[PDB]
Short mmCIF file of C-alpha atoms in Angstrom, two decimals:
data_model
loop_
_atom_site.label_atom_id
_atom_site.label_comp_id
_atom_site.label_asym_id
_atom_site.label_seq_id
_atom_site.Cartn_x
_atom_site.Cartn_y
_atom_site.Cartn_z
CA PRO J 1 115.77 82.90 102.79
CA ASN J 2 111.98 83.23 102.95
CA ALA J 3 109.43 84.30 105.54
CA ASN J 4 107.40 81.39 106.89
CA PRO J 5 103.60 81.73 106.96
CA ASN J 6 103.54 81.93 110.77
CA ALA J 7 106.21 84.65 110.90
CA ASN J 8 105.01 87.81 112.62
CA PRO J 9 106.32 91.06 111.06
CA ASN J 10 104.45 93.23 113.57
CA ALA J 11 105.40 94.63 116.98
CA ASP W 1 104.99 78.99 92.61
CA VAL W 2 101.57 77.69 93.69
CA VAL W 3 98.88 78.35 91.08
CA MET W 4 95.50 79.58 92.34
CA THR W 5 92.64 78.80 89.92
CA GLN W 6 89.39 80.74 90.45
CA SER W 7 86.03 80.07 88.85
CA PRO W 8 83.96 81.42 87.43
CA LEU W 9 85.87 84.39 86.02
CA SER W 10 82.65 86.42 85.51
CA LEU W 11 79.68 86.10 87.87
CA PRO W 12 76.42 87.88 86.95
CA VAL W 13 73.95 87.77 89.86
CA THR W 14 70.44 89.07 90.51
CA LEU W 15 70.20 91.45 93.46
CA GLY W 16 69.39 89.59 96.69
CA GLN W 17 70.45 86.20 95.41
CA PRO W 18 73.46 84.24 96.70
CA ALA W 19 76.80 83.99 94.91
CA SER W 20 79.62 81.47 95.22
CA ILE W 21 83.22 82.03 94.09
CA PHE W 22 85.49 78.95 93.98
CA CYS W 23 89.29 78.72 94.31
CA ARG W 24 91.55 75.65 93.87
CA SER W 25 95.24 75.61 94.84
CA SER W 26 97.90 73.49 93.08
CA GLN W 27 99.20 72.26 96.47
CA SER W 28 97.49 71.78 99.85
CA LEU W 29 97.45 74.97 101.90
CA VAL W 30 97.57 73.21 105.30
CA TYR W 31 100.69 74.35 107.18
CA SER W 32 102.59 72.45 109.88
CA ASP W 33 101.22 74.78 112.61
CA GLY W 34 97.68 73.54 111.97
CA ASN W 35 96.53 76.68 110.13
CA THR W 36 95.43 76.99 106.49
CA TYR W 37 96.61 80.32 105.08
CA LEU W 38 93.92 81.08 102.51
CA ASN W 39 92.69 84.67 102.19
CA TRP W 40 90.12 86.58 100.17
CA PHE W 41 90.41 90.17 98.85
CA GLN W 42 87.94 92.62 97.28
CA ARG W 43 88.51 95.40 94.78
CA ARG W 44 85.59 97.80 94.33
CA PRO W 45 85.16 100.75 91.93
CA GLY W 46 86.62 103.89 93.46
CA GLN W 47 87.93 102.11 96.59
CA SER W 48 91.27 100.75 97.74
CA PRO W 49 91.47 96.94 97.73
CA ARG W 50 90.79 95.31 101.08
CA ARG W 51 91.03 91.93 102.71
CA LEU W 52 87.68 90.27 103.46
CA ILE W 53 88.69 86.89 104.93
CA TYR W 54 91.81 85.26 106.39
CA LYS W 55 92.55 81.72 107.64
CA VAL W 56 89.77 80.37 105.36
CA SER W 57 86.84 81.70 107.36
CA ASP W 58 87.78 84.59 109.72
CA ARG W 59 86.17 87.92 108.70
CA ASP W 60 87.92 91.31 108.78
CA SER W 61 86.74 94.49 110.51
CA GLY W 62 84.18 96.42 108.48
CA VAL W 63 83.23 93.40 106.33
CA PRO W 64 79.49 92.63 106.33
CA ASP W 65 78.34 89.29 107.64
CA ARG W 66 76.83 88.31 104.28
CA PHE W 67 80.43 87.36 103.34
CA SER W 68 81.75 83.98 104.55
CA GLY W 69 84.53 81.59 103.61
CA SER W 70 84.82 77.82 103.74
CA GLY W 71 86.88 74.94 102.40
CA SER W 72 89.97 72.90 103.21
CA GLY W 73 93.16 71.53 101.71
CA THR W 74 93.11 72.68 98.08
CA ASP W 75 89.46 73.76 97.59
CA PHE W 76 87.84 76.93 98.98
CA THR W 77 84.68 78.98 98.50
CA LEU W 78 83.74 82.62 99.14
CA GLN W 79 79.99 82.87 99.71
CA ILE W 80 77.82 85.97 99.54
CA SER W 81 74.50 85.11 101.16
CA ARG W 82 72.48 87.90 99.48
CA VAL W 83 74.28 90.05 96.92
CA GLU W 84 73.83 93.82 97.27
CA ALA W 85 74.42 96.51 94.64
CA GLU W 86 77.52 97.67 96.58
CA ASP W 87 79.18 94.23 96.14
CA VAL W 88 80.09 94.81 92.49
CA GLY W 89 83.82 94.46 91.98
CA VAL W 90 86.52 91.83 91.63
CA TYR W 91 87.24 89.15 94.26
CA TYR W 92 90.64 87.38 94.60
CA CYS W 93 91.87 84.44 96.62
CA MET W 94 95.44 84.45 97.88
CA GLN W 95 97.45 81.63 99.42
CA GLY W 96 100.13 82.38 101.98
CA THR W 97 101.25 78.84 103.00
CA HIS W 98 103.89 78.52 100.24
CA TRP W 99 106.64 80.89 99.06
CA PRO W 100 105.90 83.33 97.49
CA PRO W 101 102.30 84.20 98.32
CA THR W 102 100.21 83.99 95.17
CA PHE W 103 96.82 85.30 94.03
CA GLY W 104 94.04 83.87 91.88
CA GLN W 105 93.03 85.67 88.62
CA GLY W 106 89.96 87.32 90.18
CA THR W 107 86.20 86.87 89.71
CA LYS W 108 84.22 89.89 88.57
CA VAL W 109 80.75 90.17 90.15
CA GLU W 110 78.15 92.17 88.27
CA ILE W 111 74.50 92.78 89.05
CA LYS W 112 71.73 91.72 86.65
CA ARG W 113 69.04 94.39 86.93
CA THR W 114 66.06 95.65 84.91
CA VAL W 115 66.52 97.39 81.57
CA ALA W 116 67.22 101.13 81.84
CA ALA W 117 67.35 103.41 78.77
CA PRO W 118 70.21 105.93 78.57
CA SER W 119 69.73 109.62 79.03
CA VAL W 120 71.48 111.11 75.97
CA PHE W 121 73.27 114.49 75.96
CA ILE W 122 75.58 116.31 73.54
CA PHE W 123 78.34 118.90 74.10
CA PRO W 124 79.78 121.05 71.26
CA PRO W 125 83.50 121.93 71.38
CA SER W 126 84.45 124.70 73.78
CA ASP W 127 85.61 128.01 72.36
CA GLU W 128 88.87 127.50 74.26
CA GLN W 129 89.56 124.24 72.42
CA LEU W 130 88.55 125.76 69.08
CA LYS W 131 91.15 128.51 69.56
CA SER W 132 93.76 125.75 69.73
CA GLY W 133 92.84 124.21 66.34
CA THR W 134 90.80 121.10 67.27
CA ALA W 135 87.12 120.37 67.89
CA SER W 136 85.99 117.53 70.15
CA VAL W 137 82.25 116.84 70.22
CA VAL W 138 81.06 114.67 73.15
CA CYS W 139 77.99 112.43 73.24
CA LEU W 140 77.08 111.16 76.76
CA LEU W 141 74.87 108.10 77.44
CA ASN W 142 74.07 108.21 81.16
CA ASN W 143 72.91 105.46 83.54
CA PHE W 144 71.74 102.61 81.32
CA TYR W 145 71.46 98.82 81.44
CA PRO W 146 72.48 96.43 79.86
CA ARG W 147 75.92 97.60 78.82
CA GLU W 148 75.39 96.98 75.08
CA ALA W 149 74.78 100.24 73.17
CA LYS W 150 75.41 101.52 69.64
CA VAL W 151 76.43 105.14 68.98
CA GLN W 152 76.64 106.61 65.49
CA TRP W 153 77.79 110.08 64.48
CA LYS W 154 76.22 111.99 61.61
CA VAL W 155 77.63 115.29 60.33
CA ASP W 156 75.23 117.08 57.99
CA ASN W 157 73.49 113.66 57.85
CA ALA W 158 76.72 112.00 56.62
CA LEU W 159 77.54 108.92 58.68
CA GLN W 160 81.02 109.31 60.19
CA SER W 161 83.61 106.59 60.48
CA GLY W 162 87.14 106.67 61.75
CA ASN W 163 87.08 109.87 63.83
CA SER W 164 85.42 108.82 67.11
CA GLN W 165 86.37 106.94 70.27
CA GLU W 166 84.17 105.46 73.03
CA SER W 167 84.71 104.57 76.69
CA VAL W 168 82.28 102.79 79.14
CA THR W 169 82.35 102.92 82.95
CA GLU W 170 82.44 100.05 85.42
CA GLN W 171 79.01 99.13 86.78
CA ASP W 172 77.75 101.65 89.35
CA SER W 173 77.77 100.52 93.02
CA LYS W 174 74.39 102.13 93.77
CA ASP W 175 72.09 101.72 90.76
CA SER W 176 73.94 98.95 88.84
CA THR W 177 74.01 100.94 85.59
CA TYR W 178 76.72 101.87 83.08
CA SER W 179 77.52 105.17 81.39
CA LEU W 180 79.32 105.75 78.12
CA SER W 181 81.00 108.65 76.32
CA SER W 182 81.65 108.87 72.57
CA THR W 183 83.96 111.67 71.33
CA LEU W 184 84.12 112.87 67.71
CA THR W 185 87.37 114.73 66.99
CA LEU W 186 87.92 116.98 63.98
CA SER W 187 90.28 119.73 62.96
CA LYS W 188 88.91 123.24 63.49
CA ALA W 189 88.86 123.78 59.73
CA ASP W 190 86.83 120.61 59.16
CA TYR W 191 84.49 121.44 62.04
CA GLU W 192 83.74 124.84 60.48
CA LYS W 193 82.79 123.23 57.14
CA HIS W 194 79.55 121.69 58.46
CA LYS W 195 76.44 122.70 60.37
CA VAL W 196 74.57 119.80 62.00
CA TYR W 197 76.36 117.55 64.47
CA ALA W 198 74.32 114.55 65.65
CA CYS W 199 74.78 111.40 67.66
CA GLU W 200 72.29 108.58 67.28
CA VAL W 201 71.92 106.02 70.09
CA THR W 202 70.49 102.50 69.86
CA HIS W 203 69.77 100.55 73.07
CA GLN W 204 67.41 97.84 74.35
CA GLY W 205 65.52 100.34 76.51
CA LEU W 206 64.71 102.64 73.57
CA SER W 207 61.84 101.69 71.24
CA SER W 208 63.71 103.32 68.34
CA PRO W 209 67.08 105.06 68.03
CA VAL W 210 67.31 108.49 69.68
CA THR W 211 69.14 111.38 68.01
CA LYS W 212 70.66 114.31 69.85
CA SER W 213 72.08 117.13 67.73
CA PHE W 214 73.12 120.78 67.49
CA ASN W 215 73.87 123.39 64.81
CA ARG W 216 77.38 124.83 64.93
CA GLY W 217 77.14 128.45 66.08
CA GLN Y 1 90.64 105.77 110.13
CA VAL Y 2 93.61 103.70 108.68
CA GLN Y 3 94.74 105.42 105.47
CA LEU Y 4 97.56 104.55 103.10
CA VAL Y 5 98.55 106.88 100.23
CA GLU Y 6 101.07 105.87 97.58
CA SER Y 7 102.95 108.35 95.45
CA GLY Y 8 105.80 108.61 92.98
CA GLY Y 9 104.40 106.71 90.01
CA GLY Y 10 105.12 108.01 86.53
CA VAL Y 11 107.14 107.16 83.44
CA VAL Y 12 110.62 105.67 83.78
CA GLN Y 13 113.08 104.50 81.09
CA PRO Y 14 114.21 100.84 81.09
CA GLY Y 15 117.35 100.44 83.23
CA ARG Y 16 116.77 103.66 85.20
CA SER Y 17 115.37 104.12 88.71
CA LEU Y 18 112.26 105.39 90.47
CA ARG Y 19 111.38 105.75 94.17
CA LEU Y 20 107.84 105.15 95.43
CA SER Y 21 106.50 106.37 98.77
CA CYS Y 22 103.52 105.39 100.91
CA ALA Y 23 102.24 107.77 103.58
CA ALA Y 24 100.46 106.13 106.50
CA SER Y 25 97.97 107.70 108.90
CA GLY Y 26 95.39 106.59 111.42
CA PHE Y 27 97.35 103.86 113.21
CA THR Y 28 100.69 103.38 114.97
CA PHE Y 29 102.86 102.89 111.91
CA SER Y 30 105.87 101.52 113.82
CA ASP Y 31 103.69 98.71 115.18
CA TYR Y 32 103.18 97.17 111.72
CA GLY Y 33 105.14 95.46 109.03
CA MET Y 34 104.35 96.74 105.52
CA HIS Y 35 104.10 95.17 102.09
CA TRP Y 36 104.28 96.21 98.46
CA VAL Y 37 101.97 94.41 95.97
CA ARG Y 38 101.58 95.16 92.25
CA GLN Y 39 98.98 94.61 89.48
CA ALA Y 40 100.70 94.31 86.00
CA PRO Y 41 99.07 93.89 82.54
CA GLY Y 42 98.32 90.19 81.97
CA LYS Y 43 99.67 89.12 85.34
CA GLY Y 44 97.03 90.12 87.83
CA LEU Y 45 98.13 90.63 91.41
CA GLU Y 46 101.74 89.83 92.43
CA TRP Y 47 103.26 90.11 95.91
CA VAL Y 48 106.50 92.15 95.75
CA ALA Y 49 108.12 92.76 99.18
CA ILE Y 50 107.77 93.03 102.96
CA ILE Y 51 109.57 94.97 105.69
CA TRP Y 52 109.27 94.28 109.42
CA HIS Y 53 107.80 96.85 111.83
CA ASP Y 54 111.32 97.94 112.89
CA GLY Y 55 113.12 97.43 109.56
CA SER Y 56 114.97 94.38 110.98
CA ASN Y 57 113.94 91.89 108.25
CA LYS Y 58 113.13 92.39 104.55
CA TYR Y 59 112.00 89.86 101.92
CA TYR Y 60 111.42 90.11 98.16
CA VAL Y 61 109.89 88.14 95.31
CA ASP Y 62 112.66 86.56 93.26
CA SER Y 63 112.20 88.69 90.15
CA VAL Y 64 112.91 91.97 92.00
CA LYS Y 65 115.79 90.77 94.15
CA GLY Y 66 118.91 92.76 93.38
CA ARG Y 67 116.77 95.48 91.84
CA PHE Y 68 114.28 96.80 94.42
CA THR Y 69 114.95 97.87 98.02
CA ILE Y 70 112.18 98.30 100.63
CA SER Y 71 112.74 100.74 103.51
CA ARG Y 72 110.79 102.83 105.98
CA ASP Y 73 111.00 105.88 108.23
CA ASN Y 74 108.81 105.35 111.28
CA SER Y 75 109.18 108.95 112.50
CA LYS Y 76 107.64 110.16 109.19
CA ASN Y 77 105.00 107.41 108.96
CA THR Y 78 106.37 106.59 105.46
CA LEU Y 79 107.21 103.41 103.52
CA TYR Y 80 109.53 103.46 100.47
CA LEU Y 81 110.20 101.25 97.44
CA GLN Y 82 113.45 102.10 95.66
CA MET Y 83 113.14 100.58 92.16
CA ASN Y 84 116.43 100.29 90.22
CA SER Y 85 117.22 98.46 86.97
CA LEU Y 86 113.64 98.87 85.76
CA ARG Y 87 112.31 96.33 83.25
CA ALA Y 88 109.30 96.40 80.94
CA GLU Y 89 107.72 93.70 83.22
CA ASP Y 90 107.63 96.29 86.00
CA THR Y 91 104.83 98.43 84.47
CA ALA Y 92 102.04 98.03 87.02
CA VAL Y 93 99.95 99.66 89.71
CA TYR Y 94 101.98 99.48 92.97
CA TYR Y 95 100.06 99.22 96.26
CA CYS Y 96 101.28 99.41 99.78
CA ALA Y 97 99.48 97.29 102.35
CA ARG Y 98 99.54 96.92 106.13
CA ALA Y 99 100.93 93.54 107.32
CA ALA Y 100 98.93 90.86 109.10
CA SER Y 101 100.43 89.43 112.30
CA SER Y 102 101.03 86.20 110.38
CA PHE Y 103 102.79 86.55 107.03
CA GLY Y 104 100.56 83.90 105.46
CA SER Y 105 97.47 85.95 106.15
CA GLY Y 106 98.83 88.80 104.03
CA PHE Y 107 97.68 92.33 104.76
CA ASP Y 108 94.39 94.02 105.60
CA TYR Y 109 94.34 97.69 104.47
CA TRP Y 110 95.75 98.82 101.13
CA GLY Y 111 96.27 102.16 99.43
CA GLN Y 112 94.66 103.11 96.13
CA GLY Y 113 97.91 102.53 94.28
CA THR Y 114 100.37 104.45 92.13
CA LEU Y 115 100.96 103.61 88.44
CA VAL Y 116 104.51 103.03 87.14
CA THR Y 117 104.89 103.05 83.35
CA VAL Y 118 108.18 101.79 81.90
CA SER Y 119 108.63 103.61 78.60
CA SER Y 120 110.99 105.75 76.55
CA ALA Y 121 108.22 108.29 75.81
CA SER Y 122 108.21 111.79 77.33
CA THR Y 123 105.79 112.93 80.00
CA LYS Y 124 103.11 115.36 78.77
CA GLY Y 125 100.51 117.11 80.92
CA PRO Y 126 96.89 117.51 79.78
CA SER Y 127 94.80 120.34 78.36
CA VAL Y 128 91.46 120.76 80.17
CA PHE Y 129 88.30 122.08 78.48
CA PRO Y 130 84.79 122.63 79.87
CA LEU Y 131 81.75 120.58 78.83
CA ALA Y 132 79.22 123.34 79.55
CA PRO Y 133 75.63 122.52 80.49
CA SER Y 134 73.15 123.75 77.89
CA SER Y 135 69.69 123.07 76.47
CA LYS Y 136 71.30 120.06 74.78
CA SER Y 137 72.44 118.47 78.06
CA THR Y 138 69.32 118.76 80.17
CA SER Y 139 66.33 116.53 80.76
CA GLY Y 140 63.54 116.31 83.34
CA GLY Y 141 64.98 118.97 85.59
CA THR Y 142 68.54 117.56 85.56
CA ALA Y 143 71.55 119.00 83.74
CA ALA Y 144 74.79 117.29 82.78
CA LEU Y 145 78.16 119.07 82.61
CA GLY Y 146 81.78 117.98 82.64
CA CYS Y 147 85.41 118.47 81.76
CA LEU Y 148 87.35 117.06 78.79
CA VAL Y 149 90.98 116.19 79.67
CA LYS Y 150 93.02 115.87 76.48
CA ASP Y 151 96.46 114.71 75.33
CA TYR Y 152 98.45 113.47 78.34
CA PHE Y 153 101.04 110.75 78.95
CA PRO Y 154 101.47 108.45 80.86
CA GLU Y 155 98.33 107.51 82.76
CA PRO Y 156 96.70 108.38 85.07
CA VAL Y 157 94.74 111.58 85.44
CA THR Y 158 92.41 111.83 88.39
CA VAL Y 159 89.43 114.14 88.51
CA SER Y 160 87.49 115.44 91.47
CA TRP Y 161 84.68 117.98 91.58
CA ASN Y 162 84.54 120.95 93.99
CA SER Y 163 87.64 119.61 95.82
CA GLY Y 164 85.86 116.35 96.54
CA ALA Y 165 82.65 117.82 97.96
CA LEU Y 166 80.69 116.85 94.83
CA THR Y 167 80.67 113.05 94.36
CA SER Y 168 77.04 112.07 93.73
CA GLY Y 169 76.25 111.63 90.05
CA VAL Y 170 79.92 111.89 88.93
CA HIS Y 171 81.24 109.60 86.19
CA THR Y 172 84.88 109.78 85.21
CA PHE Y 173 85.42 107.64 82.15
CA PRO Y 174 88.33 105.27 81.49
CA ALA Y 175 90.97 106.92 79.35
CA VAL Y 176 91.14 106.22 75.65
CA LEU Y 177 94.38 105.79 73.74
CA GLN Y 178 94.70 108.15 70.77
CA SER Y 179 96.64 107.31 67.58
CA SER Y 180 99.23 109.88 68.73
CA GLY Y 181 99.97 107.59 71.71
CA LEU Y 182 98.54 110.21 74.11
CA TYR Y 183 95.53 109.63 76.35
CA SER Y 184 92.27 111.53 76.81
CA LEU Y 185 89.32 111.20 79.17
CA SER Y 186 86.20 113.03 80.26
CA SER Y 187 84.47 113.45 83.60
CA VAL Y 188 80.79 114.39 83.87
CA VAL Y 189 78.27 115.11 86.60
CA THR Y 190 74.48 115.52 86.75
CA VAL Y 191 73.08 118.33 88.87
CA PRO Y 192 69.78 120.22 89.30
CA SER Y 193 69.04 122.43 86.35
CA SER Y 194 67.28 124.88 88.74
CA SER Y 195 70.46 126.04 90.46
CA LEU Y 196 72.93 126.37 87.57
CA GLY Y 197 72.89 130.09 88.27
CA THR Y 198 73.78 129.85 91.96
CA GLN Y 199 76.08 126.80 92.36
CA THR Y 200 79.72 126.70 91.22
CA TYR Y 201 81.07 123.52 89.57
CA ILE Y 202 84.86 123.18 89.29
CA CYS Y 203 86.68 120.10 87.99
CA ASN Y 204 90.00 119.50 89.73
CA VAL Y 205 92.35 117.68 87.37
CA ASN Y 206 95.60 116.16 88.68
CA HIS Y 207 98.18 114.52 86.44
CA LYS Y 208 100.70 113.50 89.08
CA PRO Y 209 103.25 112.07 86.57
CA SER Y 210 103.80 115.63 85.23
CA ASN Y 211 103.02 117.51 88.49
CA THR Y 212 100.18 119.24 86.54
CA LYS Y 213 97.11 120.45 88.48
CA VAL Y 214 94.31 122.36 86.76
CA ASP Y 215 91.10 123.67 88.31
CA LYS Y 216 88.47 124.55 85.66
CA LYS Y 217 85.24 126.33 86.54
CA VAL Y 218 82.48 125.08 84.18
CA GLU Y 219 80.09 127.95 83.30
CA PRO Y 220 76.57 127.36 82.02
CA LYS Y 221 75.71 128.14 78.41
CA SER Y 222 72.67 130.29 77.65
#
């Protein structure tokens, strides 16, 4: 349910 | 939620000297990918906040090289190698390893500089305000240091109490001084009952208190 | 050249709704995720929400889940925060910020913020009065002048001089709370006394919560 610290929200 | 504890909370520094800001996290910030997600942010007077540092030590675009970051695990330090007048502001750490990201309480940096006496000015109420039924009289103390100052209002030499309010600025990013306004507010009828309006200023840079005044009309 | 500008802050009653916007310029907006962050009394900075570059994922801090919705329109270079079910805890400055390519590194550029005040009190725009330069506001070849901005609610008022072309020597003071519950502030500037007859000094006062804009030319006293 959370975003991990290495998730990339960018293109 | 991970707690980020900064110290000190206030950091007075002489121009050109180094400064260290410390941050401790309640859990280790090492993540399973090998990275440590510890960031620093800066808020300056008049400016949007900005990131300075990410991944403990990597510096952002437009950030001068006098800023650096170090540390590991739970303990981290933001170092300014030589503080400049433009570095006044509040500095925050932020951890991103644990959910949700959390910030420290901030450290305010202020510059210790030489004593500067205020320039003192006074403004009577405008005729436009008087037509509305109120009289605000403004006393301005411009560009002084240190921040401690005493302002007293006298109306026909009677010391006033209860009808004034003061406000002081943040420290200036160029000359490291403060400014202050004190406003005396009266009804128009009360304003018209007296002649001499004076503000008296006491400050370390003045050998004796200075009075600025005017005669109504 | 990256610029972020938030808008929409003002007073809102508990339980009602308010939409914030953030206008982006100077970069390819659709290439970046976007965050909201807030700074509330006694809480410091708090991360609020993120939206992916394409709107495909959204995450929220627990306390706003079920109440706030983040969205974006890439064609209009705009980010939104729809705030429903407002609570007293929500009074804060709201910032938008451009996402880092790893979530744990946060965000690099921020806007200046927009202030949301949760309150049952009515909005009231300010009265603006000149602080004219005179023999009582001059020293050593310099003259001070200003504008007094009285009786507004909620915060903030912003002041510029000469549409932003006059910035040197300006001080705009923090607002003071009057016993009425309304705010007041002043803004002053120091200028050459020699050219008070030839230069024009106008304070530009904007109270966005009431959509009140006032431009006041400050004339010298003689």
